[PDB]
Every structure is written in structure tokens, then in C-alpha cells.
Design a protein around this ligand. Structure first.
Ligand SMILES: [Zn+2]
Ligand SMILES: [Zn+2]
Lengths: 151, 62, 82, 152, 148, 260, 167, 67, 115, 44
């Protein structure tokens, strides 16, 4: 009921200032039920979006520079990938390495460490999801996730 | 039975109790919501001293 | 206490920022002169944040030490992070 | 239990001399968390010199200024010549390694179990990665960074 | 020209580890002119590829036949002569890793360029002579055509 | 850059439903037509009730709600009547509304079924569908000896966006690509799924081979009418309403462009 | 490995020696430590009171930190160490084991108004009356009761108008 | 308490089918065959007729307030 | 208590414009059309018709909130073209398509009732 | 050299940002941090 208390709440208790908790030095809020099941399905390797679908999704990016990205597949038909659109969602130029929950433990030893057959081993570079399926481990409330590194 | 219209409630300078001049209790009494001990502790952790004083002094019983 | 040697942090704390912004916003709302230029801002909080970014808030923070002494810092003397 | 804990610690606060004190002004901690750092900014990291063996520690952290061709692969020509010729620089790097070895023993007595997971303010590997990508560092070409500049 | 690499590959295996994704398939191929291994992720739904097929692969830095950089932005209303006209399957990705057999003292005899086409991953590994055009964090095109 | 040239093929036309196929149109056009069938095809329905006497076991709002959902023949009258918003009259007039009266009293020992046949209108063209000259009459309320219901309703022009009682459809079946050739669905086990009535596949084949160059064409419709409008009148009124929405939008667009 | 014997080999690697350890159902730390072939350096107990009686206040500080950490982390959870450290310093900063109860929290010199907020409101205020105790209004509870700005967060400092800068 | 007018799902009129439904049931139809005779082909309208409890018949066992 | 009248989804409030055009500054030759008291019914068809124009580089729409009753359609065209002109042509093409569809449905009904 | 200088500045700024602020009610914060997880761990 005063400008002083309003400024206090706006500078101390606002939700974005509350993303990381001092209790366990990690995010306290993360991506949750539908958005998490769907981002897992969306960042799978075989998710291909058509031009109209991509424009529909870009309508819902607030932080979009208005430039349609070059599709990952140009021929025989232009197709964007879910990782290619989440790369637009990912802010700044953050860099992050995670592993999808189904990541086999004997894959980081053998070959294909940097080209994962299962599309596990999340790698975000310069704010582009170079590879990997996003999940709780990448967008949840754990330490070192994309939301934490973004904050 | 739990419909929202029987639960929604708001207050801005309504009636107060007789003994301690604080907001009444309940929707039916047009009462205010309790800013309890745990809310006090939360706002102490926040460090919001003026908001804490507003809730526990100025919005209750100056 | 010797103002030549102030031991407290040269940064403005989050609480100092909060209270300074609230105080200056109330002062602006009570028709105090504004220290910065204004395009179309009419909200006292926006004007106070513009003054803080410009380092033109005429407030001194008196930080008390546990021993009882105090240190006076101008809002322009502190490092504003957020 | 929650109420009891709160009423026991409610007035403990970080003061402007950076000590943590209670209402009586008694000192509970000379610095918050023994390090004077807030818990939101710290994060998990790894101490790289804790677990490795003496041979591995030597091989990974001792700057080898004798292998001319390896330096030629890592550094530019003027840096290679300065590193190989100058002895002041070589002594600086030698003392750098000695200081890291002393740090290794300090870590070994701090963490008597070989657990390199630590919680520290700045994620140095992530910052190094950020610098690599911001300045377009080519990992395959020799660098123009003088190791003496790194030490200083 | 703007071509970083060109060769003819022969599909020697498809999904050795089993089908991981429905519309995407991993091809393990080998060329003949350069003896380069290739792991490639392709959308087999729109561009099916059978075992034993033979195709020409062209990693390029640009699609315009004349040396001219790309802006990385989608411009379907572009009437310039694009080399994608001469190919069937075209993808657009970025190099995210370059490995090699280099030592602390010796340079690399064999390189291994890794590219990601919006998540569809490729590894082109072989002699370092054929992979000087590849630089990490650099955008390239696939330009792949099937031949009989 | 220009319009489609859709074609139409009506495969069934009864008094109860119309089953047709639109080819060579976009899926958005087909679904907007489907949505307008439900939500922007006006009809006449009771939207004002005045209970003068109700001794029945259902309270007043129950009877009013129940009267609102009785379909009224709206075929040629709905285009002529105005919205009460647009009428320059008082609360009501014959240009924007239709008056109904209901007056029933159970004096006899058997239960009296107050049905839609008891809704007497001033307009002969706008009457309850069941009362039109088989299907029985919609039951408004059952009355016991000594119970009585006397009310006065007014029916208005509206569409399904405002209330489902102004929805003329009793189901709009809409389908496309009956054989999953565009793969807009992905069956985990395509053999487990029954075949569409519009499918053209031999029984061994579960779904059509995937069409990479395909687009949704050939949309199948089954527009069932609640009774107020004929099904073909629902479709024609839907097309006209969508076209007038677009025309009004273009008029306002032209004013905004020229004002800049 | 948390109970194995972690040594440093001559090559400099951490090696976990798999050795016999005993777990007792009672505690005599005083006696068990002073037994032949018993390690008097790593042998410990979970009874913090005995640790305080045998080893002292800093030993019980460390042991109490260990036991609270064990309770918190047993379900895989994690809490920043500064919170455990602050709780453990609160219980040990006065040289004795200060329980988080009325018997430990209302027995320190915190002021009668802070104490009445927690427990034993009437007994505390009556004791303060009988002994003429004075509350200096240093804590947050006392200021909150009197409707004054708590010396907490935004209240831990004062603001002054800068006359020379209003120009 | 009384048969709804429309089907909640599609909006098909079911109010005029309760009495016919009961007459078919006393005519030794099965509930499924009765629902087929009335033209309720979607399982939503079959739900409407098949799950209806005519409570109004019990409310009409009480004398009204006025004679 | 808080239920908006059902007509507020269809009816314009006094002084509220049916459509508003705002230049998009992020990219050139782009506009935002904020259309009040419409929903997916017109948004989807206008978007899909705009996608048929090769001079349209972007065509999308969104209902920013289902409880609110407006849509926003973003249209970007090639520099020689205009988003307002594209939007106008899309509406004209939809109107012509619906007129043709209506006439052909009338013909089909006449054939079906006759034989 | 440019990358290393930027890295040094970044480390310095982030470290100074990690320093605890005078006025933080670390005691109430610690009580909450230790009591909130207590509500999930098992009674038996
Ligand atoms: Zn009228
Ligand atoms: Zn139904």
C-alpha cells in the first residue's frame, strides 16, 4: 500500500529474482508436466516441423528477432527441427552439457561419444541446442541445468 | 460442493474486531486474511522490513 | 569514523537498492524535483530507477556497524549491480 | 521443529562489517558460511588437482618449457622464443607449479576423502567455454597467450 | 566455389544399434575416392535410403554457385542459382567438433569433423588433407544426391 | 497467391443430416467452415422467459433453461429477423423476436406431460421442431393434479458462440485423409485401428503408403441438424456467415489502411 | 567409501582400503577410545552429548554438522553447507550445547520480548518483571511487536537526504 | 430430475425420446436395441438415455403446495 | 460474480477498433494486425491463405489469451509487396473461394434433391 | 590474450556478485532451508 513497500517487493521478492534458491544453490522452479513431456517429445531427433507449423510456433516467442532460421532440411521439402526452434527459445549464448535420463552409461566410453545414437548427451552451444533430448535433467530444478545456467 | 464463488474473498479496510482493533475473521464477517508467524518468517528471510511493517503494523492495527 | 577509510562494501546491497528506490519514488510522488530528464515517465518508481541508473539520487546511506559507528555513502559513490 | 528453528535463528544477520551476528551482537560467524558468499551464486565444480596421481598431476599441470616442438604447436613463434630463451619466465612457471603442488597438499588435508566435488562461486570451466565461444577460439591453432601473462 | 568437401559414398550399414527414431535413420557409409568414413542422420521419411545405395555427398559453405556468403536466414523467395538444384537431399547445419589423432608434438594425420543439422548428426572422418575446409562453429550444407 | 477452386459432392441429403465432401480446399478453410456450422450459424431460440405461475416440481430457472434448448424452426425467418442489438425498438418487437405462450394446468388424475407442443407462438413460421407437421414432442415438465405452469417466452436471433442453444447442429462429423497417408496421426500399431467409412484400402492394408508431397484435401462432412435449420441451410448459412465476417473484416481493414 | 579407510598411495592416488569396522548399540566413547588396537582418531559416535563431554565444543560442533548432514542427505537431498554451519554455530557459540528449545533458546540473553514470542510468554515476562530486565529492542521480534522497522534487510541502515546534491 | 433436452456433448435432442425409450423397454427391447430404434448412434446420446434417472416421477408423489 | 457476458466474445466495445495495424520494427516489411472479437475461425483461414502468397515471407496468428477475445496476425512480405496488401488479397481470395463454394454447394443440393 | 582478459574480468565481477549482502537474514533463511526439506523426509 505504499511506493516504498512496492519498490521493496519489486526489487527483492519478485518471482524472477526468486528462480534460484539459496537453500541448495539451484533453481526452485523448472519446466513442469505438459511442457516437460512435450519438450522431451519435441527435442527428439525425428521431430520435423513444416513452414506453417514453424510460423505458428514463432508467433509464441516473445524474444524472437523476427528472422526465420534456415531449415535444417532444405530438400526435398523444407523442414525445421524441434531443436532448431528450441535454439531460438534458448536465450543469450549460454553453453550447457547435460545427459538425457535414458543416456546409457557405457556410451561416453566407446565411440559415438560426440555423436550419440540415442540423441542423449544434451549439448547447447552459443544458445543453440546442438544436440540431445531435453528433460527434467536439462530444464528441471536441478543444479547446472539450462534454466540454472540461464539465470 | 466446493465452488469458487463460495470461497473467493477480498478485503480493503473493512470491519475490525472489538478487543484488538484488527480485521475480522472470515468471508462472512468481511474479515481479513491472517498474516501469520510463518509469513512473518518468510518476509524476514526476504529482508522486506517495510513490507513486514506494513503487514504487521499498518494494514492490521495502527 | 574516518571517512577517508570506509570498511564497508563499495557495492549497493539489494536491500539498499530496494529501500533507496522506494524512498526516492515516494519523494517524487510527493512532488520532489527530479534529477534526470524525463521523456514521458509518470510512475515514480520508473523515475527513481532512471535516477539510480543515472546515479542522480540525492540520498546518503548511513550504514551502521556492529560496534556502533557508521559510514555514510552517497548513492553515486556505490556500485549499482542490478 | 520449523518454528523452533526459526525462533532460535530469527535475528542472526550479516552485518556491514561482514560478520554474522545475533541480536545480542555476539559473533556467530566471522564470515557467512566461513567464506562470506551468498548461497544463490555458488555452484558445483570439480577440483582438478585433488584426485590425480603425482605422475598425472605433473603431466597435466607442470608447464613443459623444454619440448620445443610441443610449444611450437601450442604457442606462437615469439611466445615460443621468449618461453624457451628467458629464464625469469621459466622460474615464474616453476614457482607456479610449486604453488599448485602446495595447494594440492592443502586440498588433500581439507578433503581426506577423494571427493573433488566442491561448491564455489564462479563456474570457471563454463566461463572458459564462454570465452572460447565469444572470441571464436580455434583449438587447433597455436595461441597468442603468454603463459607469464596467465600467471600474472 | 564454396565447396569444403565432395565424394561418392556407399551405404554400408543402416542403424547398426537398431532403429532409434522412426523418421530418422543413421547411415554408416564409406567412400572410394578418399577412404572416408561417414555417420549421417537422414530423414528417411522424405528421402528413404536403402542398404547398399550409392550417393554423392557435398559439404559446402554456401549454396550459391558463385562465392558468396550466406546469412543463415531462410529466404524462400531467392532466385539466384543455387547448387541445391543439382541435389535431392539438402540439409543445413553447423560444425560443432573437429577431432584428430594429433599428439602433443605431431599434427593430425586423420581428422573427424562433426556437424549437426538441427539435431541430425554427421561425422565425416578420414585423412586430414580432405578436412581443411571444416572449422568449428561454422555453417555448412549437406547437398546429397543418390546415383545409380 | 490466389483463392482455391473448391468442388463439392453431396453423398447424402435427408431432413436430418447432410453428408458431403469438399475437395481442393485448405484444411483451415475446411475447419473454419466446420466451426461456423457450430458457432456462427444463427437460429431462433427462446432467450427470455417470464413465469407467471409455476407450481411444478422444477424451479423457474430449470423451466427457463429447458425452454431455451427447445429448437425452433428458423429456416426463412432467421435471415429476416434482426438482433435485438440492432433493432431500433424497445425490449421487443416482431422484427427482432418471436413471442411464445405456454399455459398448462393438470386438473386430471394422470400426470400431464407439458411438452413442446404446448409452446404456442404468435409467428406460424417459428414453431418448435417437434410440433412441426413419428418423433414425439420434447418434454418440458411433468405436472401432477393441481400443478400449473403459465409462462411467456420470447425467442431471439443468436449463434453458438453466445450459447449452445443457438447451435443448429446435433453433431458435425469432420474427417480428412481417411487412410493415414499424410501421417498426421502416427498409430503405434496401425493394424489395431478400424477403417474409416471413407477408406479405400484392401483389408490387408492398414494405412495408405506415406505421401511426402501430400496436403489435406478432400474433407468429408456429416452435418446433423438439431431441427431448427435444414442441414443444407446450415451449410449455406455457414458459408454466407463466414463470407460476411470476411467482408466486414475487409471493410474495417480498408478504413484502417486509408486512415493511415 | 564413507566408512572405508581412504589413504593416499605412494604414487599420489586416493585408495579406499576395505577394513573391518565395528558398530555398537550403546556408547562408551570414553572407554572404547582407550582400548588397544582401537583407532583413537577416527572412532566417533552419534551421541553428540558424549562427544561434547569427551572431546569438547568444537568436536561436537563438527560432529553435529556431520549428523545433521547425514539426516538431510540420507534421502539424496542436498542443503547448502552454510545453513548447516549457521545452525550448528547457533547451537555451540556459547560454549555449551544449546538445544533448539525453550531450555536452550530462552536461557540466553536474547531479551524478554524475543523470548516471550517463542514460548513461556507469561513466565518469561514475569521473570523479567521480578528482575527488572530491559529489552534493548535489538532483535526483529521486539521491533515487530512494537510496530517498528526491524533491523533486518531493508531496515539495517538509515537513509539521509543529500542537501549538497539536490542542486 | 427430468430427461435433458439436448445431449450434453453433441446437442442432439433427447428430450422427446425418454417416453418412447420406456415404451420400447416395456415392449421387450433390449436397451441397446431400444437406443438403436430411437436413432441414438453416438455413444454420447446413448449415454444420455441409458444413464438417465427419472426422479421427477418420485417428486410427483408429493402433493403440491396449492390444491 | 465474474462471468463475462457471452456476447463479449463477438461484440465490439464502444470505441474499440475491429482491426489495428502496427508496424513491426524488428524486421522490415512486417506488420501486426490486432483483430478484436475474432478467434481461430478467421485467424486460421487468413493465415493459411497468406501462406499461399509467394510474396509473403511470414504469416502467423495467435490468440494471446483464450479468456480474451482478440487475435494477432503477423504478416511479413517481400520488399516489393506490403503486408497490408497481402492481408487484403488474402481476404479477397477467401471471399471468392467461399462464394464459389457456396454456389457449388447450391448446385450440388439442387442436383441431389432433383436427381 | 583478449579471451583471457575478458575471463579475468568475468571472474572478478561474478565473484564480487557472489558476496553476501549485509542485511541478509541468514538465520531465518537457514531455518527455512533446514525446515523445508524436513517436511519431505520420512517420519518412520
Ligand atoms: Zn426489436
Ligand atoms: Zn450426443
Amino acid at each position: 500500500q505504499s511506493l516504498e513497500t512496492r519498490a521493496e517487493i519489486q526489487e527483492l521478492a519478485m518471482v524472477p529474482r526468486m528462480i534460484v534458491t539459496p537453500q541448495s544453490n539451484r533453481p526452485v522452479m523448472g519446466i513442469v508436466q505438459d511442457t516437460l513431456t512435450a519438450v522431451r517429445k519435441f527435442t527428439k531427433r525425428d521431430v520435423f516441423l513444416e513452414r506453417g507449423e514453424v510460423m505458428n510456433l514463432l508467433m509464441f516467442l516473445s524474444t524472437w528477432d523476427g528472422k526465420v532460421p534456415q531449415p535444417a532440411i532444405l530438400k526435398p521439402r523444407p523442414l525445421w527441427t524441434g531443436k532448431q526452434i528450441f535454439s531460438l527459445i534458448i536465450p543469450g549464448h549460454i553453453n550447457c552439457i547435460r545427459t538425457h535420463s535414458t543416456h546409457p552409461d557405457d556410451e561416453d566410453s566407446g565411440p559415438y561419444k560426440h555423436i550419440s545414437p540415442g540423441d542423449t548427451k544434451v549439448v547447447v552451444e552459443n544458445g543453440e541446442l546442438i544436440m540431445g533430448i531435453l528433460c527434467k535433467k536439462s530444464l528441471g530444478t536441478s543444479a547446472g541445468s539450462l534454466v540454472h545456467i540461464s539465470y | 460442493k466446493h465452488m469458487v464463488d463460495d470461497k473467493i474473498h477480498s478485503r480493503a479496510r473493512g470491519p475490525i474486531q472489538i478487543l484488538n482493533r484488527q480485521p475480522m475473521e472470515g468471508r462472512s464477517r468481511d474479515g481479513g486474511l491472517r498474516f501469520g508467524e510463518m509469513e512473518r518468517d518468510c518476509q524476514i528471510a526476504h529482508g522486506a522490513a517495510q513490507f513486514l511493517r506494513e503487514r504487521l503494523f499498518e494494514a492490521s492495527d495502527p | 569514523q574516518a571517512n577517508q577509510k570506509r570498511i564497508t562494501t563499495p557495492y549497493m546491497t539489494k536491500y539498499e537498492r530496494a529501500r533507496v528506490l522506494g524512498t526516492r519514488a515516494l519523494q517524487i510522488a510527493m512532488c520532489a524535483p527530479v534529477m534526470v530528464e524525463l521523456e514521458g515517465e509518470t510512475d515514480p518508481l520508473l523515475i527513481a530507477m532512471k535516477e539510480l541508473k543515472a546515479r542522480k539520487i540525492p540520498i546518503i546511506i548511513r550504514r551502521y556497524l556492529p560496534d556502533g559507528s557508521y559510514e555514510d555513502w552517497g548513492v553515486d559513490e556505490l556500485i549499482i549491480s542490478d | 521443529i520449523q518454528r523452533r528453528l526459526i525462533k532460535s535463528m530469527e535475528s542472526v544477520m550479516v552485518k556491514y562489517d561482514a560478520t554474522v551476528r545475533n541480536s545480542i551482537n555476539q559473533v556467530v560467524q566471522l564470515r557467512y558460511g566461513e567464506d562470506g558468499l551468498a548461497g544463490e551464486s555458488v555452484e558445483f565444480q570439480n577440483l582438478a588437482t585433488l584426485k590425480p596421481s603425482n605422475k598425472a598431476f605433473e603431466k597435466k599441470f607442470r608447464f613443459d618449457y623444454t619440448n620445443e616442438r610441443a610449444l611450437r604447436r601450442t604457442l606462437q613463434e615469439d611466445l615460443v622464443k621468449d618461453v624457451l630463451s628467458n629464464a625469469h619466465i621459466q622460474n615464474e612457471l616453476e614457482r607456479e607449479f610449486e604453488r599448485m603442488r602446495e595447494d594440492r597438499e592443502v586440498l588433500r588435508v581439507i578433503f581426506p576423502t577423494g571427493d573433488s566435488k566442491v561448491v564455489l562461486p564462479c563456474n570457471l570451466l563454463r566461463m572458459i567455454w564462454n570465452a572460447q565461444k565469444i572470441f571464436h577460439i580455434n583449438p587447433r591453432l597455436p595461441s597468442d597467450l603468454h603463459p607469464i601473462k596467465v600467471v600474472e | 566455389a564454396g565447396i569444403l568437401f565432395e565424394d561418392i559414398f556407399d551405404v554400408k550399414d543402416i542403424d547398426p544399434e537398431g532403429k532409434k527414431f522412426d523418421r530418422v535413420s543413421r547411415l554408416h557409409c564409406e567412400s572410394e575416392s578418399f577412404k572416408m568414413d561417414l555417420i549421417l542422420d537422414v530423414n528417411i521419411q522424405i528421402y528413404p535410403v536403402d542398404l547398399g545405395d550409392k550417393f554423392r555427398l557435398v559439404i559446402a559453405s554456401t549454396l550459391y554457385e558463385d562465392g558468396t556468403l550466406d546469412d543463415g536466414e531462410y529466404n524462400p523467395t531467392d532466385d539466384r542459382p543455387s547448387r541445391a538444384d543439382q541435389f535431392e537431399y539438402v540439409m543445413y547445419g553447423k560444425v560443432y567438433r573437429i577431432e584428430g589423432d594429433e599428439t602433443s608434438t605431431e599434427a593430425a594425420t586423420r581428422l573427424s569433423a562433426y556437424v549437426s543439422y538441427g539435431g541430425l548428426l554427421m561425422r565425416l572422418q578420414g585423412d586430414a588433407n580432405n578436412l581443411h575446409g571444416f572449422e568449428v562453429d561454422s555453417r555448412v550444407y549437406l547437398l546429397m544426391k543418390k546415383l545409380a | 497467391p490466389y483463392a482455391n477452386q473448391p468442388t463439392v459432392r453431396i453423398t447424402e441429403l435427408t431432413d436430418e443430416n447432410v453428408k458431403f465432401i469438399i475437395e481442393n480446399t485448405d484444411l483451415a478453410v475446411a475447419n473454419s467452415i466446420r466451426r461456423v456450422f457450430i458457432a456462427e450459424v444463427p437460429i431462433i431460440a427462446i432467450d427470455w422467459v417470464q413465469i407467471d405461475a409455476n407450481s411444478s416440481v422444477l424451479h423457474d430457472e430449470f423451466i427457463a433453461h429447458r425452454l431455451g434448448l427447445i429448437p425452433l424452426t428458423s429456416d426463412d425467418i432467421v435471415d429476416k429477423l434482426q438482433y435485438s442489438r440492432d433493432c431500433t425498438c424497445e425490449e421487443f418487437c416482431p422484427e427482432c423476436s418471436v413471442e411464445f405462450t405456454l399455459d398448462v394446468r393438470c386438473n386430471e388424475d394422470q400426470t400431464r406431460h407439458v411438452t413442446s407442443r404446448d409452446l404456442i407462438s404468435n409467428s406460424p413460421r417459428v414453431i418448435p421442431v417437434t410440433s412441426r407437421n413419428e418423433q414425439d414432442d420434447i418434454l418440458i415438465v411433468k405436472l401432477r393434479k393441481g400443478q400449473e405452469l403459465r409462462l411467456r417466452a420470447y425467442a431471439k436471433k443468436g449463434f453458438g458462440k453466445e450459447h449452445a442453444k443457438w447451435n443448429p447442429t446435433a453433431g458435425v462429423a469432420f474427417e480428412y485423409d481417411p487412410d493415414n497417408a499424410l501421417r498426421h496421426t502416427v498409430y503405434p500399431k496401425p493394424e489395431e485401428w478400424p477403417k474409416s467409412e471413407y477408406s479405400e484400402l484392401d483389408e490387408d492394408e492398414s494405412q495408405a503408403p506415406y505421401d511426402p508431397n501430400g496436403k489435406p484435401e478432400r474433407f468429408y462432412y456429416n452435418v446433423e441438424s438439431c431441427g431448427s435449420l435444414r442441414p443444407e441451410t446450415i451449410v449455406l448459412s455457414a458459408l454466407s456467415g463466414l463470407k460476411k465476417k470476411l467482408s466486414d473484416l475487409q471493410t474495417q481493414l480498408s478504413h484502417e489502411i486509408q486512415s493511415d | 567409501d564413507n566408512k572405508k579407510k581412504i589413504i593416499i598411495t605412494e604414487d599420489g592416488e586416493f585408495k579406499a582400503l576395505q577394513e573391518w569396522i565395528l558398530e555398537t548399540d550403546g556408547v562408551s566413547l570414553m572407554r572404547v577410545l582407550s582400548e588397544k588396537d582401537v583407532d583413537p582418531v577416527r572412532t566417533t559416535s552419534n551421541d553428540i552429548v558424549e562427544i561434547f563431554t569427551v572431546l569438547g565444543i568444537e568436536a561436537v560442533r563438527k560432529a553435529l554438522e556431520r549428523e545433521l548432514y547425514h539426516v538431510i542427505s540420507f534421502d539424496g537431498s542436498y542443503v547448502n553447507y552454510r545453513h548447516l554451519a549457521l545452525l550448528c554455530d547457533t547451537m555451540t557459540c556459547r560454549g555449551h550445547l544449546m538445544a533448539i528449545t525453550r531450555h536452550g533458546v530462552n536461557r540466553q540473553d536474547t531479551g524478554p520480548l524475543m523470548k516471550c514470542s517463542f514460548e513461556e510468554t507469561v513466565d518469561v515476562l514475569m521473570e523479567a518483571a521480578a528482575h527488572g530486565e530491559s529489552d534493548p529492542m535489538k532483535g526483529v521480534s521486539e521491533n515487530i511487536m512494537l510496530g517498528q522497522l526491524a533491523p533486518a534487510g531493508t531496515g539495517c541502515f538509515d537513509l539521509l537526504l543529500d542537501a549538497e546534491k539536490c542542486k | 430430475m427430468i430427461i435433458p433436452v439436448r445431449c450434453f456433448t453433441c446437442g442432439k435432442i433427447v428430450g422427446n425420446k425418454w417416453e418412447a425409450y420406456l415404451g420400447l423397454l416395456q415392449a421387450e427391447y433390449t436397451e441397446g436395441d431400444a437406443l438403436d430404434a430411437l436413432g441414438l448412434k453416438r455413444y454420447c446420446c446413448r449415454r444420455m438415455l441409458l444413464a438417465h434417472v427419472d426422479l421427477i416421477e418420485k417428486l410427483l408423489n408429493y402433493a403440491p403446495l396449492e390444491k | 460474480m465474474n462471468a463475462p457476458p457471452a456476447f463479449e466474445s463477438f461484440l465490439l466495445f464502444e470505441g474499440e477498433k475491429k482491426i489495428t495495424i502496427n508496424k513491426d520494427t524488428k524486421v522490415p516489411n512486417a506488420c501486426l494486425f490486432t483483430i478484436n472479437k475474432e478467434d481461430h475461425t478467421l485467424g486460421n483461414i487468413i493465415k493459411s491463405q497468406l501462406l499461399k502468397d509467394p510474396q509473403v515471407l511470414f504469416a502467423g496468428y495467435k490468440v494471446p489469451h483464450p479468456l480474451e477475445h482478440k487475435i494477432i496476425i503477423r504478416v511479413q512480405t517481400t520488399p516489393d509487396y506490403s503486408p497490408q496488401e497481402a492481408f487484403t488479397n488474402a481476404i479477397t481470395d477467401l471471399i471468392s473461394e467461399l462464394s464459389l463454394l457456396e454456389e457449388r454447394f447450391r448446385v450440388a443440393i439442387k442436383d441431389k434433391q432433383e436427381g | 590474450g583478449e579471451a583471457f582478459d575478458w575471463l579475468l574480468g568475468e571472474i572478478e565481477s561474478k565473484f564480487n556478485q557472489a558476496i553476501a549482502h549485509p542485511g541478509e537474514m541468514v538465520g531465518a533463511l537457514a531455518a527455512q532451508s533446514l525446515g523445508e526439506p524436513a517436511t519431505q523426509m520420512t517420519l518412520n
